[PDB]
Amino acid sequence: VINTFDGVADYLIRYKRLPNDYITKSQASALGWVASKGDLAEVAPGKSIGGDVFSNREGRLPSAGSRTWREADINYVSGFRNADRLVYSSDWLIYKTTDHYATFTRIR
Numbered sequence: 001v002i003n004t005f006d007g008v009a010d011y012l013i014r015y016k017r018l019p020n021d022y023i024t025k026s027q028a029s030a031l032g033w034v035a036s037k038g039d040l041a042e043v044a045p046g047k048s049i050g051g052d053v054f055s056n057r058e059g060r061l062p063s064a065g066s067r068t069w070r071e072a073d074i075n076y077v078s079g080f081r082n083a084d085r086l087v088y089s090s091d092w093l094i095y096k097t098t099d100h101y102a103t104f105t106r107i108r
């Protein structure tokens with residue numbers, strides 16, 4: 001599937017949405033996923049969580065009037081979710097984090 005930093009980043013720039021393998025938290029919950037159970041791959045085979053609002057409460061990403069952020073899990077396969085996320089803005093800035101939003105690197 002398309003679940004790498006570069007693969008998802010390029011698909012976002014190109015189509016302005018996540019690839020077909022992503023589902024929001026409420027979609028995942030509707031399918032049987034429970035936070036802490038690590039069951040995502042069994043209730044939603046081949047799927048990853050992404051598309052939900054990232055608030056940027058800590059102000060680690062640049063802010064701009066009208067700019068909002070969304071996030072998506074990266075390199076997920078099965079089991080417990082990892083700490084890899086792509087965070088992407090309404091104006092298409094794209095940052096990666098490999099430590100669950102402690103630190104970011106810009107890639108688009």
Ligand SMILES: Nc1nc2c(ncn2[C@@H]2O[C@H](CO)[C@@H](OP(=O)(O)O)[C@H]2O)c(=O)[nH]1
Nearest residue numbers: 052053054055056057058071073085100101
């Ligand atoms: N640190 C931090 N996490 C956030 C913020 N807004 C949303 N989140 C989170 O991003 C997620 C999606 O709403 C959640 O994490 P998660 O990716 O571990 O599920 C969640 O905690 C924020 O402003 N700061």
